[PDB]
Design an enzyme around this catalytic site. Structure first.
Site, short mmCIF file in Angstrom:
data_model
loop_
_atom_site.label_atom_id
_atom_site.label_comp_id
_atom_site.label_asym_id
_atom_site.label_seq_id
_atom_site.Cartn_x
_atom_site.Cartn_y
_atom_site.Cartn_z
N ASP A 1 -10.64 -2.39 -4.35
CA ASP A 1 -9.17 -1.46 -3.91
C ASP A 1 -8.92 -0.01 -4.51
O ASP A 1 -9.15 -0.29 -6.75
CB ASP A 1 -8.28 -2.06 -3.83
CG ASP A 1 -7.10 -1.22 -3.36
OD1 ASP A 1 -7.06 -0.30 -3.28
OD2 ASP A 1 -6.51 -1.72 -2.89
N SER B 1 0.72 -1.14 -0.02
CA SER B 1 -0.20 -0.37 0.24
C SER B 1 0.63 1.43 -0.20
O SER B 1 1.57 1.49 -1.60
CB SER B 1 -0.61 0.05 1.51
OG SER B 1 -1.91 0.88 0.71
N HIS C 1 -8.59 -4.36 -0.65
CA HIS C 1 -8.15 -3.53 -0.38
C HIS C 1 -8.07 -3.70 1.08
O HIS C 1 -8.52 -3.32 2.05
CB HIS C 1 -8.18 -1.67 0.01
CG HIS C 1 -6.90 -1.49 0.37
ND1 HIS C 1 -6.02 -1.16 -0.45
CD2 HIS C 1 -6.44 -0.71 1.12
CE1 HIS C 1 -4.65 -0.99 -0.14
NE2 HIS C 1 -5.05 -0.82 1.80
#
Length: 317
Positions: A259, A159, A289
């Site tokens: 996501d 991320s 996500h």
């Protein structure tokens, strides 16, 4: 039935899931540190050792601590993964990634340098990426003493950590000091412009969404940052903005279906491929996500096994 494409296994685990709302950063850090903290408590370190390293900061910056995970009873010199945790540039700690770092060291027999970079907004760009590059510089300059093969250094992260990894890999190539053998980008946060379809349509997806993305980039880039139309944004901050991707390392990039980061991930992988880079791209179905948190779901287990396979091959001799 809110998200009918969700894997049923992932389906369950969505009532519990607390909200991480970037708008209240003190509480966001608090809720986060609590979901991390209870999970670490039971973590097994069987077969590995962990010690703290201190890398000199870039410029006048403070030392950057590294949680250095190594496999017990190995020959050495071994390959190393420089790992960078996520948290939208503003939350999280390196210890939150101990489970994965332990897994890499125990199953692959690689050293793992898990970097404690400074968080935004208290430290804005370029500080966090400079910390990661300082850590890379350090592990490269001290590889012999550390028992690392400097020709087999991977840089990776998840991320925001994926964006910091990609920015660190761009900086490494551009500066020409440290050779990076492999790049591992998990659900990476790469583009502050927020203009892909997934980033315009995913406003209340699980864990990450457009409201949090706006806050994340603002925290990271600071008050001289005028938003998505700003033309003056470093490629080390937002790797999606880079125009020349040639000569970057073989890369693995994973994305999730629901996501908001999905499209910027797929687009960076495609542009890497078009620039001549060897890339493995995998967008997993029925995911969101952060759904790898649901570790028992078959799709999470599949992605976890593939990450190990990818890193093992990326750093093969």
């Amino acid at each position: 039935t809110t998200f009918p494409t969700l894997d049923p296994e992932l389906a369950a685990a969505l009532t519990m899931l607390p909200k991480v709302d970037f708008a209240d950063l003190p509480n966001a850090r608090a809720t986060y540190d609590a979901l991390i903290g209870a999970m670490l408590a039971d973590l097994s370190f069987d077969g590995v050792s962990l010690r703290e390293l201190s890398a000199p900061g870039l410029d006048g910056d403070p030392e950057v601590k590294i949680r250095f995970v190594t496999p017990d009873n190995t020959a050495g010199p071994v390959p190393v993964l420089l790992w960078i945790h996520g948290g939208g540039f503003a939350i999280g700690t390196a210890e939150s990634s101990d489970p994965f770092c332990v897994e890499v060291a125990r199953e692959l027999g690689f050293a793992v340098a898990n970097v404690e970079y400074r968080l935004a907004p208290e430290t804005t760009f370029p500080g966090p990426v400079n910390d990661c590059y300082a850590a890379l510089l350090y592990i490269h300059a001290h590889a012999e003493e550390l028992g690392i093969d400097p020709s087999r250094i991977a840089v990776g992260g998840q991320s925001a950590g994926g964006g910091l990894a990609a920015g660190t890999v761009l900086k490494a190539r551009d500066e020409g000091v440290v050779p990076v053998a492999f790049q591992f980008l998990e659900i990476p946060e790469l583009d502050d412009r927020l203009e892909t379809v997934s980033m315009t349509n995913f406003v209340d997806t699980p864990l990450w969404h457009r409201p949090n993305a706006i806050l994340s980039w603002k925290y990271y880039l600071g008050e001289s940052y005028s938003g998505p139309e700003d033309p003056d944004v470093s490629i080390y901050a937002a790797p999606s903005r880079a125009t020349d991707l040639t000569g970057l390392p073989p890369t693995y990039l994973s994305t999730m279906e629901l996501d908001p980061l999905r499209d910027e991930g797929i687009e960076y992988a495609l542009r890497l491929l078009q620039a001549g880079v060897s890339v493995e791209l995998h967008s997993f179905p029925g995911t969101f996500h952060g759904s790898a948190l649901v570790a028992t779901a078959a799709v999470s287990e599949r992605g976890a096994a593939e990450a190990l396979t990818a890193i093992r091959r990326g750093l093969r001799s």
